[PDB]
Point group: D2
């Protein structure tokens, strides 16, 4: 049912668990914000799957062969041809990570006053869109905002919402469609190939461009192979290649499905757009032949992207996350369903029924999880959404969750059992979790550096 | 009951993951001899725990700081102070691995005609003793020769057997006592501290030297902390240091409990013998400051020896092997008991009761294990026993076993489940396992290059 | 006169060593543009000293100990304490390289309509200043614009020019003073400590902030120790620490004097500005605890910054460049004087007097240098100057040069002889060097992808 | 005349020079024996070219891909096919270093009472020969024992001495001919292909086997390409392959011309001899599939052997040594001529004319070189030869030299200038070097651990 690791351990990293009394003082030192905890004080660090992956022996062999030249590096050509072969795009510009590519795309394809629509948003992607004068519109299906609803391909774009946007606003006022695979905020939920084919069908008829947020496209491809009829005989590589044939470009964070600790890139097919991207990348990232990355990192990212296409690797990656989610569900712990490809999301509304959203249950639950287990998790609720135009009123999203994000090839099933057993025991006395109050809030992006205090 | 890994994965090693029908063709190409399989064709390689360990990030950092000087390397001095601090011996000479140190010890401490006694033997250790003119005498307790007998500290030396040897032959005719921790041939069985203190008491009264075969002393130290009363408050380091306080020297294979892939050393307290050891090491290994080792390897062994002292590491190491043994026992699979610190031994005679020892049941069971799971194990029965060269007849041992030897920090519990589930599945249909016949047998060391075919 | 390397070679990098007739075919394939050569076809790559450095064994040991956590990495804290100890600034935000830090500084410290003044400019620094609405004013001393003038500390700011700006425009209309050490565009010319103290004296009296472009501050510190009276007893570290005591912050490119292949950071003393910097870094680079960098790269930069403080290292670095300049000057080759800390600039106008600037003598000389020696150099003349987009006419700079930029710890004196002997041999028959004509010119950034053919 | 390094520096190792007053105390602490100095106290360590080489980026990439399996490692198969391809031998057995292979060969091919003849000897090779009951006979040409005689191919075997040995002793009493390439004790002197062809011609006519000591065969191949008529058009690989076609086997120390820090192997063509070697290697070294080496070290040795065949690499290696020798000769310093492939030998008899061989001028000169320059060198004189059968009488060889041994790819020409300038200045007051007296002498192999005191 759950496969063993399709690899061996080459090298290990020592870990240690500090006692509860010290975890409590660390949590108070961090202002009850898991973002402010020190890495050395964490047993199992499930804060994010971004850049926290373990590399292979092949990737580390490439690390010893870094061609650090400013132009014409062999590492760049290797990364270039690999992406052209696997993704099928004509041009590629490397960037130091995903939000570097998003900065380039938002300045190239957005006119002040236009609309950008997509299946939910991400914080950095939406910021660069809004900074360049766009208004974001969520066109994901309504069921994606309901945590407990267990349906397949929750991340699909609602075609009726997309049709309604084109009719009310016009096609000329739409910059592009931003299709994310997978959808991070909905719980790592996949998008079906039929939805990608249908979106491409409707947008091309109105001359609207489609750009993918491809950070977790490999996990998305596995869900297509597993659950969409007609793709069970297709390889992961074939599905990934067909996915991108419905996009005019993409922004990629190699720190996710490329199995590296740093790196990203921007892809496109248009020649004029690629020429403008090279003029903008030298301002923010670097030369088009390295783009803010060391040669050895372009090499590791090229090798890692090819390793991710192995069916056994991605099957184990996804089913390890599913294993953690199944143990939590079997004990009655409320989670977002279905389990996504990279994380399990605890439903803090049901976990902390005795608390209101104004008491920040997700931020308080993440603090209690660390103090009780030594596991770091990320708040994904009201604090990440922010406040807008009303003086002091928070955004209220339906999803008030705590994210247990699994780095790739770093932890074992026994580590998943430690996480599950500690959360299940915490769920027994969930009424003890206390509310939080803002003692410091930045002007923007409060989730990263805000400090709180108990109620 | 079974702890999770007290570390996370830093880097992984790629494996093939070939299907069963291809593993069958690989096994036929190897003549149904697991010793002839190529490493690249193996999922889980349980052939040996020697030199197959995974190193830590700290060790690989030391690998980058290799002082490769021919004499006076900083890496040697680091290894020297580490062993002097942890083992308590005065002098140390590095060797490329354990049998290099045994070659030196046998030439230094044995006069032609003397006797060497010890708690059973190992192949290379007994050869160097006999090569230099010694006669080996087994003084282990009788209970060590009972495979199914589940008692603690099976590797203890029988004090009455040792007393009888001293009286009949004399103390001047005894070269030394060779005390192995643990006892590999008995199944990795530990020796009690009380037995070590008693041997030191008896030999010192007759002027007899005691040298340890300390290859797996860390695993032995854990058994003392776990099962011997009075040591439950002692750290692993304190137990190890007290163990060697009853010996005049030791031979160590770092490829086991020092958590490296190559290396060993020879320790002693006598100054004159250390002076002769330095003259002999330059003939066979190298300078006393590197002894057949690269500088970076002395550094990794010094770092690894200190990492082995962590209680959580060695507890998990031993309980990971115990997990495999308990799962096999709970399903009714016959194993050697009790489970040792480094391996589980399947009883192939009881596993393949429908086959005779002339049909090589252990060799045939090892072949089936690979084909069904991709797991390589080692035959330890009539094939590895060899032939008597005078009569031409096989040596026939009471132990017809298959050894599942677990490298340190390489595999997870999920890998142990792969091994267990496939063997349990084989045991349910064990009547289908067929005998083997020699199609090629070399003159000597037939275990390594013999080829077979089904009967 | 010229010291030997204060280090030995730990590991080497393979090179092709292709003959002259093949280098000619490579140059023709590259359209006679050294920017289009492949790295694998280059023996000595003097294109830039940015990110091309060789690291030490200590740095590579740190590469194995990367803490890749998203927040609170131990590598960040190590980098933080190192910069606070060596530079003396209160706060630090890491960036993926120098132009990432410049993007942050320009958005934080510039109000639309204000002025920025500095000792000449750099391309990326001036862009981010002008992008945020500033007007750049050159306040360097007039002597910096004389190529052949051999005087010390050519990069000093003219205090009278700075005083005139404050009086005519007002202090409230001045964003900050951008003091670069060293001054790249003037040829890597250093700034005196007395000039730094005087600028801090004048700006502090008017409430004006001073930010350093500290990319090559270590090379600058050596010039102070070597040529400025009163600092001959001071260590490199003491001089560096005193330099930054006259600044309110700095932007650093670790790819230069931090002896790494990627990395940078932003420093400042003000608490409120540091609070705003943490909100802005998560948009463009990443979390304030990694800032677009892998953990291992923050570790290598922390180790490399401390290695750069060794007097013997920086003395050899600078005198290796001086050796190349002295050998060219002793043979009569026209170079920019005095020789800077990181590169030698050939005067291509005097080298190719028989050619006009419309025939691209610097671009043609760089092509001949590669074909004759396998050395890549960078054109810094009319081609890299660009075209005015309104008129369509080339920008015509007084400096028509070829830059021989020396990476740190990569090449030896024998490699410098290869460069010198081939250029001296070319200078003896310089009348044979032919002009070039555009066969392909891109719309922008023509230096990188233009292709030429002989005239 | 002298080529630059045909590689770039990938990573560096920090070095440091301790003052003279500390170098003096270190030399006294070492008993005036450079073998007892600590590596950290040495600026330029010219003690040996064995295992002190710098590896390439390709080799370090292979280090990350160590297949550490006990049998069937991919690293072993790579090393096996590389040696079969480059050396042309049928079988190969890996060993941890050269003297491990010599131990195997001496036990396989020597009967007690037989003679072994060769072009001079080495300490470990002659010991294993004499330990197994052989009597060594030097059959090198007489001119090899004259330090100042500058003739080509000084290491050739005298065919008349070989013919005389066969006639006086008989062919059945000759175990084999041990042909070393190059000849270490004569100054690294090459053997001509014509001499190898002639030796093979004479021995095959009497049924006598020939085994090569191939540790520095690549350096030998370069001398053949440079100085022997008819081989100037042949590649290094072709010459190496033809060299071994005149041998029945070889012993190799990879620590020399394979550009690694540890490793060796034994080659042969006979099937019965290879079968016996596998039985003996498991006793002393390990399995025939790893032979006392980690997988990653077999990989580095396989990659390094192929890199050594590059003409530019070996040309620079040899001419860098020649550069040091030419500077010493141009200043009047007495050296062994011609300069060998791996070291310059100072003639201590002419250097210390005022001292007798009983005062150990070579051992005293090596001590003075370190104290005055921080350079470590090796004594190669009376102390290395030993005493035999007379009670207290030393062996007296014509060569009383001090060896300046150059590791491969570690030092630069500027480092050679530091060595030369310090020795030339020492030669000005050579009358100050004092004699030495034995204060401690081991029973055997006194050169490594003897301690001395001034006269
Ligand atoms: C869908 C998606 N797009 C873009 C980014 C930004 O990419 P980057 O610049 O970090 O490489 C992220 C980052 N998500 C991370 C940070 C997370 O989920 O924790 C993401 O999840
Ligand atoms: C010709 C020759 N053969 C064999 C050996 C022994 O090989 P090893 O066991 O050291 O790999 C050496 C070692 N010479 C070294 C030690 C030297 O000249 O310093 C040697 O020079
Ligand atoms: C108890 C014991 N002593 C000595 C040795 C020899 O040490 P080297 O292997 O380091 O020379 C071994 C190795 N046992 C290995 C070979 C096994 O169990 O497969 C051993 O188990
Ligand atoms: C003085 C100076 N400031 C800022 C920068 C930009 O820093 P990053 O390159 O780290 O973004 C550079 C780089 N100069 C390089 C590009 C050269 O001289 O080729 C520089 O020389
Ligand atoms: K770089
Ligand atoms: K070495
Ligand atoms: K990271
Ligand atoms: K190994």
């Amino acid at each position: 049912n759950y496969p063993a690791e399709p690899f061996r351990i080459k090298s290990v990293e020592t870990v240690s668990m500090i006692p509860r009394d010290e975890r409590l003082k660390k949590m108070q030192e961090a202002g009850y914000n898991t973002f402010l905890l020190n890495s050395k004080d964490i047993y199992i660090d499930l804060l994010t799957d971004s850049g926290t992956n373990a590399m292979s022996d092949k990737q580390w062999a490439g690390m010893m062969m870094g061609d650090e030249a400013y132009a014409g590096s062999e590492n760049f050509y290797h990364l270039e041809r690999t992406v052209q072969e696997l993704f099928g795009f004509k041009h590629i510009v490397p960037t130091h990570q995903g939000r570097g590519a998003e900065n380039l795309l938002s300045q190239l394809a957005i006119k002040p006053g236009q609309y950008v629509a997509g299946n939910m948003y991400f914080t950095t992607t939406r910021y660069h869109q809004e900074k360049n004068g766009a208004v974001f519109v969520d066109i994901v299906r309504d069921e994606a905002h309901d945590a407990g609803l267990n349906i397949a391909f929750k991340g699909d774009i609602d075609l009726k919402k997309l049709q309604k946007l084109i009719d009310e606003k016009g096609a000329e006022n739409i910059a592009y469609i931003c299709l994310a695979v997978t959808v991070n905020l909905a719980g790592g939920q996949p998008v079906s190939m039929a939805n990608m084919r249908a979106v491409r069908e409707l947008t091309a008829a109105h001359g609207i461009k489609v750009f993918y947020d491809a950070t977790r496209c490999v996990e998305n491809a596995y869900f297509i192979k597993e659950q969409e009829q007609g793709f069970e005989n297709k390889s992961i590589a074939e599905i990934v290649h067909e996915m991108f044939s419905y996009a005019d470009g993409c922004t990629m964070s190699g720190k996710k499905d490329c199995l590296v600790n740093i790196g990203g890139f921007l892809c496109m097919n248009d020649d004029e757009m690629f020429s403008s991207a090279k003029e903008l990348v030298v301002v923010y990232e670097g030369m088009p032949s390295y783009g803010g990355l060391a040669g050895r990192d372009m090499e590791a990212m090229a090798i890692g992207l090819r390793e991710a296409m192995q069916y056994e690797y991605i099957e184990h990656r996804v089913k390890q996350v599913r294993y953690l989610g199944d143990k939590l569900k079997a004990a009655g712990v409320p989670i977002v369903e279905p389990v996504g490809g990279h994380a399990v999301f605890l439903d803090a509304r049901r976990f902390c029924e005795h608390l209101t959203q104004d008491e920040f249950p997700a931020q308080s639950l993440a603090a209690s999880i660390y103090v009780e287990t030594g596991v770091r998790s990320m708040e994904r609720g009201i604090i990440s959404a922010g406040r807008n135009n009303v003086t002091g009123e928070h955004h209220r999203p339906k999803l008030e969750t705590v994210r247990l994000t699994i780095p790739r090839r770093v932890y074992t099933y026994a580590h998943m059992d430690v996480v599950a057993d500690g959360i299940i025991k915490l769920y027994q006395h969930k009424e003890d979790i206390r509310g939080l109050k803002f003692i410091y809030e930045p002007k923007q992006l409060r989730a990263f550096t805000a400090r709180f205090d108990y109620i």
